[PDB]
Design a protein around this nucleic acid. Structure first.
Ligand SMILES: [Mg+2]
Ligand SMILES: [Zn+2]
Ligand SMILES: [Zn+2]
Lengths: 1154, 198, 120, 76, 49, 298
DNA sequence: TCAATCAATTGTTATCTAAGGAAATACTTACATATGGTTCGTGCAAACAAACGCAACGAGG
DNA sequence: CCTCGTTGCGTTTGTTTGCACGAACCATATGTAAGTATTTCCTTAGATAACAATTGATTGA
């Protein structure tokens, strides 16, 4: 229907064209019969009827008379919905400046006229005069007088003198100026001037003038002579119960404007003295400012209460404005919410939905089925049946939801898996039942959490829920490739308990005919669940494609592992169940099943694992008692020895040998040593102390202590918590940071005394407050990341670029922090990868490195592999699928259309609460460090020049090239290199943290992307989080989206114009058809906030950050937003160009370019 | 009348009484808030004001506080805490002579608490007022240490005096992590009266 | 009684941006519904009633059905009067009155208006 | 019955064209203009369309060919 | 509240993350039953019609 | 204006169900998931089922050990009552009840509390015993509580094991659970978070005034906010029709939602999305400033 | 001996997601006159409503 | 086939509705005050960080 959205200035003629009449009075309602007043803010003639097809007076109350205007009242008869579209206008008796274009900082009115905003505000508030082409004899045009000077020149000059006051003077200046001649003169000044501050001012002024004269805008339109009026239904005056009315603040602001305008008209009619008229014009200006913004004028005007009135601008900007509260998110029909319970019987693809919830959510479907199956004659009858809940309504409801998925969503949707589709199974209750394996994805527990259910209505939405969002399709993380439906705590405990072996167990040694014999032996009580036995077992191997060769062998295992082996699918080795099966083992086993067998066997295996683990954790009778927290017998000895050392060192301090701080540090060290000793003794006493005998003297086996088994299996707890339970809970640091010299020696099995508990609360509250105040900034970071990368989609299949990045294992300090396998898994090689000896082509050029190629590389010990990256792709407006890689949510290459920018933002952002995080915020904002690194700007020989107060001028001279670049380096910066040396480009001269801008400028795009990915990955790795580098590289590519034209040459650009890099790329592509190019650029690097705010679309940039600035710039420049983005289409309610709508959008282009 | 009604009806510090419990009522009535007209705001309070202070000992509960936007701003009064004539919280202590723990109670304010060394409630007495141990654990100025029997001026009146009424209804509190004790007190403020009180 | 009217006279309207006790994001305007809206069930019922009247008037003699469609504004312009219908049928007004009474009687038959009475 | 769509995604690919083609075909069945091509098992038209895709009986190419031939035979 | 005979054990995933498994005797004895009086006001006003 | 007010007071009775939040005093939250038949519950040698089953994995990660202690002592307390109960079911004597109750109040360590039953008249001792037949209340002050050895001694006074764990049997199968489990008495609370007051659904209802969108939660029968992050999740999927219907026909398109309701009524699950009304409001609001914003290529 | 370039001050903009809670209350011009709108009861013609009489029709005999 | 019961049509008598029309009673809008009288308040708190612009001092030419 509409292709783009155009924004520009509004002329008085345009504002009148919108208008359907002039709001002449401030009246709204008649206070006795509440009908609208004749020419007021709620007027039937101007804005339309208040009842459907009913004339206000009462002479026309039928649809038949539609299309006529009455005579006793002059009210058109039509629908009432037109009240939401009809606008009015107010004819101001005095021009008033638009506050946005006067108080934008920079002020468009001030910059256009080259007049300081101070002078303009002085003239506007009738404090000083301004000459207006007032004769080219004694006073210049832009000169400003005062009362003294104006009166002086009055008798001295009658004619050829024009000095006016207020906004009429500003309008006269803005209308008398001609843009082309001013642009020409300023171009001459710019070309014949050498000063960077004045140069920059001239560039800014020229850009405003050119973007103004190119568009249809006229400067005088920045002074409002006609004021548009919002439709009444958008500023309602509705009745509240009890004879009270609820009104919008816009009514009050408009009433003030109308009152003051009418008073000004009256005063000018009376020919009142200039002082009174000037005061009234000041008041009218203030009223218009308040209506538009209710700020930028010192004091906002408050209403009947003491709260400032909400202005026209306040209803668009902010977290509560239209853009973010009603256009990017919404309240939605066909939705419910309830508490979540567990329901461990469910299959992975289904959820328990309460019958009443389903009955309410599917009401139209039920009405349709009732009518179709003949059980209700009319829709009202079907409604009555559904209200009465007759027996057959439930049968209809069962038929309706048979294969209708529903979307389950938990409140903080940190990533994709926060919404998942499930098949409903109707439950006689009121709490939604959630499969235990999706709780980790939801980050959901069952201590009072709630979930929202949404019904997909159309066939497309239902098929999308089934084929994209179904919980069975989402079993791998989209951040890393790791599985996300791994069994969590009770399942892990059950499998761990059933798989580990005892030393002398009932039924040990006997030889079994298979897993069925093992299960029969255990369930009949003749053998212990974990008794070391031999058993005939039949593995299946899928060496080649398809064929599953069977290998039967006598394995030495336990009864429990043999029992578990029946759950495993065919093409998996038996060794996966011949270990103790902790949390890590089960996750690796599910990953192996997915990578060998596929998706369906993995889903079945996950369900069976959950069922078996629950069953055997139940049978285990695992419990927690006070005896299960065993304290080391040496704890008393250790604390006594540490206290004796403390007393000794305290005496030494009292002997005048060591300062109090050093004594405190020594005490801290010895107490930490004692804490480590206690913890080690506790773990030794609790992990393997269990001693028993097998037909002999004695043996040793791992402990069956319940707490220990929970910690070791990975079900719940960790060595830190276990030591806090049995051993001392270490030293406490007061929230300042100082470690309390006296450490808490009591654990929790024994009590904490009052002092220790007070000290513990010191840090407990600090942690709670920190986590309460952390997710805010992490959410802000995720919002910025999503806004920068929202318009990134896999548009092509292969760009054909050869450029890539070299991935090597990260080593720091002689140890590997992350191997090459996990860095190069799923990325397409950019250039052919040879063996270290150059023997032959190990892997072809453009192969997607799955785990087989990665295994080959590991076997042949290849250290560096050059793989394609999103940051080096050649695709315009998107990226090919071969530069992205594997689509870590699936195993196959990324599909065409996937919104990889949103996925990258969510993957980077959802772990931010585990974080530190301000370091990542700094990296993505590309902030320059406080004391940066002075890198070598150019290659050459270095020398020193003047070294006076104007700090040392360093000169680097190339062998042949010119060397006008000299750096003003401080003396208090320690030079890394000597005075008489030679330095290469992008080298280090001083010492300090390297700013990302300088890394990009001197070393390159690969250098800066490597810097960013390595630093942020260092943060996340330190904190234990796993994120693929695809996502960080996506964010970096979005940060590198602009370029400055160092030499326009024969292109159609300026010099300092910061163009979008894709535009200059296509321009340099096209100009290769010709001969002349002369177009050279320097890539810029902006922060995510700065990169996303400086984007082609003005709607997507106004929608998230400061809206006044973006809207004013787009209005003065006359920007035209072709949607071509996810945010833009989400706002206008169209199919986003990302997923199943991508094709649709492409088709639209097919029809648009014809 | 308008001023009085505006205060008592529509003001931040006058709120609907939590009435789903005896404990909820009692712990609402003795509730301290740093917000309201004349105090901070939950949006821009700052961590330092939210944090537990060593002067909170015996005057403001360390754990009974809401977790969320206003944590450390809605503290609750401790069991024995009082208020000066001037409005400063004071807590009781039993006076210690040379070595005898007398039964006379002095209410010490926060600024007066530093100037003496105060023994702990978990300190022993040999049936006549004298400390069994010659070195007793005390707190003088923010920190705690060991002091000679003939050094202390005051002793804690009871071992319950650091907690609020709700926190002091948790058996085996000393065995519970401070986060979970905070949660437990907050939760037992919300228990619904059942058909028969057991 | 004038005293009661003067006291009832509406006080100053409440701002629709009035915070609710939470004072965070709940404003008065968040609790006010559009009273002049057609519920989807009502609109669907209107459509079904139009269809039912069509399918019921279909089962009437030609002139009786036309008379009934004219006397009420059934899928046409303003309703006609009996005199106008005579002006178009060229018959006496009382004749059209009798015709419409008989048509309504026939439409009152059971097994002919059970769905129509279900519409009540 | 339906649990996962991996054979239909395999047979069509792109995981997005599958949704569009399945929606086209399910709407064809839903409106009284077409009949299932696989034995109905009490399934909804969406699942029936997916099961037809898995069998290979429905593609985006098959659907447009059938639409074209229906148009051509409409001339009669 | 009520003092209840509690056992600490997994029991089949019906107390998985923090879920609680309750016996029917607890419901039969109505020992976690509560009474919830509530007001509902019908106000008749003076409308224009 | 108001002529007459009639207030009706209703008295509901909320029993218990899955979804209701329970809690102990030690920060151990929990939502009821299943209500079990009495013959499915674990039971001990005497055939007495446990009322509640709590996950032991909740305890170690969050160091709230008090509950475990509270359980042990709880058992001990009930144990004393059980003994008293027996001595009251058979009319043993005043002397035996007095002796056992007196022994139960002494319990070893030097506690500041003294109870002398000698001053209790026979009639008063019987009243005390009748009040103690449901269990013996025990006070465990905040930081001056009951030591673990005292808990074991009280467990010994009753005939309960001092380990705090008994062997339990599966009601489903009658098989003995391995690895004895911790059973006792814990004080559970019913929190004011009833699933009766929290379940909520909506197909269509009232709509907001300026923006033609559903309203708030469960008091205006309003819908669920499909906020911006949910939109991001839909965008990360390919779900473009889901997203479009979510933000056009389910929320804001005035003409679209009525057509969708009708189309669903006759089993045609197709939508005519249209332009959401809130974007129209935004256009009229930007135009109400002196800014001309329009749609191109009409 | 002026002005291009640092440096401190001022002003603008930003700070997680959902569910519950309902809003309040000071702050007084009066007496007279012209006019005009609104409410109310009426009349007149039009528009329905009842109950027949006559004639045509079409079934019965 | 003749004759008698049912229906189409017009007629006569009787009743409710739709407009238009005074009449009167209150509602609104507007005017007129002649000891003097002469520049306002009031409000509000314990953020924090980042980023530009603007204004002021230092320094290269
Ligand atoms: Mg929770
Ligand atoms: Zn009219
Ligand atoms: Zn590429």
């Amino acid at each position: 229907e509409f292709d783009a959205i155009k924004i520009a200035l509004a002329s008085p003629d345009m504002i009148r064209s919108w208008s359907f009449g002039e709001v002449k009075k401030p009246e709204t309602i008649n206070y006795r019969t509440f009908k609208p007043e004749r020419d007021g803010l709620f007027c039937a003639r101007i804005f339309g009827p208040v009842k459907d097809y009913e004339c206000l007076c009462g002479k026309y109350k039928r649809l038949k008379h539609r299309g006529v205007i009455c005579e006793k009242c002059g009210v058109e008869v039509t629908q009432t919905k037109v009240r939401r579209e009809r606008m009015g206008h107010i004819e101001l008796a005095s021009p008033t400046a638009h506050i946005w274009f006067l108080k934008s900082l920079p002020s468009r009115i001030g910059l256009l006229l080259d007049m300081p905003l101070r002078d303009i505000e002085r003239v506007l508030y009738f404090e000083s005069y301004v000459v207006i082409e007032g004769g080219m004899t004694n006073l210049e045009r832009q000169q400003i007088l005062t009362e003294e000077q104006y009166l002086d020149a009055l008798e001295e000059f009658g004619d050829e003198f024009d000095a006016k006051m207020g906004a009429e003077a500003i309008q006269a200046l803005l209308k008398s100026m001609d843009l082309e001649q001013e642009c020409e003169q300023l171009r001459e000044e710019l070309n014949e001037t050498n000063s960077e501050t004045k140069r920059k001012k001239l560039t800014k002024r020229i850009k405003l003038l050119e973007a103004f004269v190119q568009s249809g805008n006229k400067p005088e339109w920045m002074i409002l002579t006609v004021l548009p009026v919002l439709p009444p239904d958008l500023r309602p005056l509705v009745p509240l119960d009890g004879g009270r009315f609820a009104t919008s603040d816009l009514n009050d602001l408009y009433r003030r404007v109308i009152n003051r305008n009418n008073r000004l008209k009256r005063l000018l009619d009376l020919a009142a003295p200039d002082i009174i008229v000037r005061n009234e014009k000041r008041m009218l200006q203030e009223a218009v400012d308040a209506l538009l913004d209710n700020g930028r004028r010192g004091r906002a005007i408050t209403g009947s209460n003491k709260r400032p009135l909400k202005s026209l601008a306040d209803m668009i900007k902010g977290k509560q404005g239209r853009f973010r509260q009603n256009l990017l998110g919404k309240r939605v029909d066909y939705s419910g919410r309830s508490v979540i319970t567990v329901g461990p019987y469910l299959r992975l693809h289904q959820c328990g939905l309460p019958k009443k919830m389903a009955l309410e959510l599917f009401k139209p479907f039920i009405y349709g089925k009732l009518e179709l199956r003949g059980l209700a004659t009319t829709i009202k009858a079907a409604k009555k049946m559904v209200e009465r809940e007759e027996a057959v309504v439930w049968d209809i409801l069962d038929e309706v939801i048979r294969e209708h998925p529903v979307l389950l969503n938990r409140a903080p949707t940190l990533h994709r898996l926060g919404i998942q589709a499930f098949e409903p199974v109707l439950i006689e209750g009121k709490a939604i039942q959630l499969h235990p394996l999706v709780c980790a994805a939801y980050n959901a527990d069952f201590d009072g959490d709630q979930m929202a259910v949404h019904v997909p209505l159309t066939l497309e939405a239902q098929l999308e829920a089934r084929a994209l969002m179904m919980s069975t399709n989402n079993i791998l993380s989209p951040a890393n490739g790791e599985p996300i439906i791994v069994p969590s705590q009770d399942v892990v405990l059950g499998l761990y308990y059933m798989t580990r072996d005892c030393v002398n167990a009932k039924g040990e040694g006997m030889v079994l005919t298979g897993p069925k014999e093992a299960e029969r032996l255990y369930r009949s009580g003749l053998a212990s669940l974990h008794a070391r036995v031999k058993v005939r077992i039949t593995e299946y191997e899928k060496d080649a494609n398809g064929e599953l060769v069977a290998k039967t062998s006598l394995k030495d295992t336990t009864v429990g592992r043999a029992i578990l082996w029946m759950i495993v699918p065919k093409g998996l080795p038996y060794s996966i169940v011949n270990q103790a099966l902790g949390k890590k083992a089960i996750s690796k086993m599910l990953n192996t099943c997915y990578r060998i067998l596929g998706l369906k066997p993995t889903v079945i295996f996950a369900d069976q694992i959950m069922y078996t683990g629950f069953a055997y954790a139940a049978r285990s009778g695992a419990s927690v008692g006070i005896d299960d927290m065993v304290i080391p017998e040496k704890k008393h000895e250790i604390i006594s020895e540490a206290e004796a050392e403390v007393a000794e060192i305290q005496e030494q301090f009292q002997s005048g040998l060591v300062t109090a701080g050093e004594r405190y540090n020594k005490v801290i060290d010895i107490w930490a040593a004692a804490n480590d000793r206690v913890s080690k003794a506790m773990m030794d006493n609790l992990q393997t102390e269990t001693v028993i005998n097998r037909d002999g003297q004695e043996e040793k086996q791992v402990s069956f202590n319940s707490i220990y088994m929970m910690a070791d299996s990975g079900a719940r707890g960790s060595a830190a918590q276990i030591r806090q339970l049995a051993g001392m809970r270490g030293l406490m640091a007061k929230p300042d940071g100082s470690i309390i010299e006296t450490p808490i020696t009591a654990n929790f099995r024994e009590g904490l005394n009052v002092l220790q508990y007070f000290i513990s609360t010191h840090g407990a509250r600090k942690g709670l407050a920190d986590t309460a105040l952390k997710t805010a900034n992490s959410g802000y970071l995720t919002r910025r990341l999503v806004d920068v990368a929202q318009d990134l989609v896999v548009t092509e299949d292969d760009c054909g670029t050869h450029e890539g990045i070299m991935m090597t294992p990260v080593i720091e300090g002689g140890d590997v922090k992350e191997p090459l396998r996990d860095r190069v898994l799923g990325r397409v090689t950019a250039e052919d990868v040879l063996k270290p000896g150059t023997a032959d082509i190990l892997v072809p050029r453009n192969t997607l490195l799955h785990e087989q190629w990665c295994d080959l590389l590991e076997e042949n010990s290849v250290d560096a592999v050059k793989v394609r990256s999103v940051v080096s792709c050649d695709t315009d407006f998107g990226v090919c699928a071969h530069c992205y890689g594997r689509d870590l949510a699936r195993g196959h290459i990324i599909n065409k259309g996937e919104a990889i920018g949103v996925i990258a933002a969510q993957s980077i952002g959802e772990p931010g609460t585990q974080l530190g995080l301000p370091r990542v915020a700094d990296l993505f904002e590309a902030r320059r460090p406080k004391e940066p690194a002075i890198l070598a700007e150019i290659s050459g020989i270095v020398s020193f020049g003047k070294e006076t107060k104007g700090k040392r001028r360093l000169v680097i001279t190339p062998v042949d090239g010119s060397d006008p670049y000299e750096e003003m380096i401080p003396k208090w910066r320690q030079l890394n290199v000597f005075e008489g040396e030679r330095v290469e480009r992008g080298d280090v001269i001083s010492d300090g943290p390297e700013a990302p801008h300088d890394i990009l400028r001197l070393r390159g795009v690969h250098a800066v992307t490597r810097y960013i990915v390595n630093e942020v990955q260092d943060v996340y790795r330190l904190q234990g989080v796993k994120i693929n580098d695809k996502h960080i590289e996506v964010i970096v590519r979005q940060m590198l989206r602009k370029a400055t034209i160092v030499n326009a040459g024969s292109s159609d650009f300026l010099e300092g114009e910061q163009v979008e890099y894709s535009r200059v790329k296509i321009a340099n592509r096209e100009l290769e058809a010709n001969g002349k190019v002369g177009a050279t650029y320097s890539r810029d690097l902006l922060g995510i906030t700065k990169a996303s705010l400086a984007t082609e679309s003005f709607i997507s940039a106004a929608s998230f950050q400061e809206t006044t600035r973006v809207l004013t710039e787009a209005a003065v420049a006359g920007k035209r937003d072709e949607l071509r983005g996810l945010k833009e289409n989400v706002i206008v309610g169209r199919l986003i160009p990302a997923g199943t709508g991508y094709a649709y959008h492409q088709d639209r282009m097919r029809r648009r370019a014809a | 009348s308008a001023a009085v009604k505006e205060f008592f009806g529509s003001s931040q510090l006058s709120q609907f009484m939590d009435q789903n419990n005896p404990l909820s009522e009692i712990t609402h009535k003795r509730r301290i808030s740093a917000l309201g007209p004349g105090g901070l705001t939950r949006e821009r309070a700052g961590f330092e004001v939210r944090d537990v202070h060593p002067t909170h000992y015996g005057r403001v509960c360390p754990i009974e506080t809401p977790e969320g936007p206003n944590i450390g701003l809605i503290n609750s009064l401790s069991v024995y805490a009082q208020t000066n004539e001037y409005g400063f919280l004071e807590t009781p202590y039993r006076k210690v002579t040379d070595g005898v723990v007398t039964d006379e109670i002095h209410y010490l304010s926060a600024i007066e608490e530093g100037n003496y060394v105060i023994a702990q409630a978990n300190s022993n007495l040999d049936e006549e007022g004298h400390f069994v141990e010659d070195l007793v654990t005390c707190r003088s100025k923010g920190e705690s240490s060991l002091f000679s029997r003939d050094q202390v001026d005051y002793m804690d009146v009871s071992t319950q005096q650091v907690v609020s009424v709700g926190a002091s209804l948790i058996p085996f509190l000393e065995h519970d992590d401070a986060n979970r004790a905070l949660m437990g007190a907050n939760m037992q403020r919300q228990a619904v009266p059942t058909l028969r009180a057991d | 009684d004038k005293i009661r009217k003067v006291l009832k006279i509406a006080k100053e309207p409440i701002s629709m941006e009035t915070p609710i006790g939470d004072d965070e994001d709940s404003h008065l305007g968040d609790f006010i519904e559009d009273t002049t809206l057609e519920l989807p069930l009502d609109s669907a019922t209107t459509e079904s009633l139009r269809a039912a009247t069509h399918d019921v008037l279909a089962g009437l003699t030609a002139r009786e059905a036309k008379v009934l469609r004219m006397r009420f504004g059934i899928d046409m312009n303003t309703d006609y009067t009996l005199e106008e219908v005579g002006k178009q049928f060229d018959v006496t007004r009382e004749r059209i009155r009798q015709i419409e009474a008989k048509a309504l009687r026939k439409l009152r038959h059971p097994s002919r208006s059970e769905v129509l009475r279900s519409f009540l | 019955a339906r649990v996962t769509v991996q054979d239909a995604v395999e047979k069509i690919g792109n995981r997005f064209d599958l949704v569009l083609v399945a929606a086209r075909r399910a709407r064809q069945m839903q409106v009284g203009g077409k009949d299932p091509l696989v034995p109905e098992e009490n399934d909804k038209t969406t699942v029936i369309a997916l099961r037809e895709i898995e069998e290979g009986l429905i593609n985006n190419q098959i659907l447009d060919v059938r639409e074209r031939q229906e148009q051509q035979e409409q001339e009669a | 509240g009520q003092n209840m005979r509690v056992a600490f054990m997994p029991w089949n995933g019906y107390n998985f993350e923090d879920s609680i498994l309750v016996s029917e005797r607890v419901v039969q004895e109505d020992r976690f039953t509560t009474i919830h009086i509530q007001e509902l006001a019908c106000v008749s006003r003076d409308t224009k019609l | 204006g108001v002529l007459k007010i009639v207030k009706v007071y209703l008295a509901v009775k909320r029993r218990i169900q899955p979804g209701d939040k329970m809690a102990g005093r030690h920060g151990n939250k929990g939502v009821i998931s299943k209500i079990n038949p009495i013959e499915d519950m674990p039971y001990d040698e005497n055939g007495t089922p446990v009322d509640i089953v709590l996950n032991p994995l909740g305890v170690p990660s969050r160091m709230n050990i008090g509950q475990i202690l509270e359980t042990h002592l709880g058992m001990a307390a009930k144990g004393i009552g059980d003994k008293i109960n027996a001595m009251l079911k058979q009319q043993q004597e005043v002397a035996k009840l007095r002796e056992f109750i007196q022994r139960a109040y002494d319990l070893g360590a030097d506690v500041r509390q003294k109870v002398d039953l000698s001053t209790f008249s026979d009639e008063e001792v019987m009243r005390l015993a009748e009040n103690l037949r449901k269990g013996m209340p025990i006070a465990t002050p905040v930081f001056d509580g009951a030591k673990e050895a005292e808990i074991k001694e009280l467990l010994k006074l009753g005939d309960l094991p001092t380990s705090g764990q008994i062997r339990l049997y599966d009601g489903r199968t009658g098989e003995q659970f391995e690895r004895p489990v911790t059973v006792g008495y814990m004080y559970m609370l019913k929190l004011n978070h009833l699933v009766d007051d929290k379940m909520h659904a909506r197909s269509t209802g009232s709509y907001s005034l300026v923006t033609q969108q559903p309203l708030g939660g469960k008091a205006q029968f309003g819908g669920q906010r499909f906020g911006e992050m949910e939109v991001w999740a839909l965008e990360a999927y390919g779900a473009a029709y889901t997203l479009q219907e979510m933000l056009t026909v389910k929320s804001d398109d005035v003409n679209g939602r009525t057509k969708m309701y009708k189309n669903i009524v006759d089993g045609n699950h197709q939508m005519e999305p249209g332009m959401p009304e809130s974007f129209n409001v935004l256009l009229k609001e930007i135009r109400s400033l002196g800014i001309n914003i329009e749609l191109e290529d009409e």
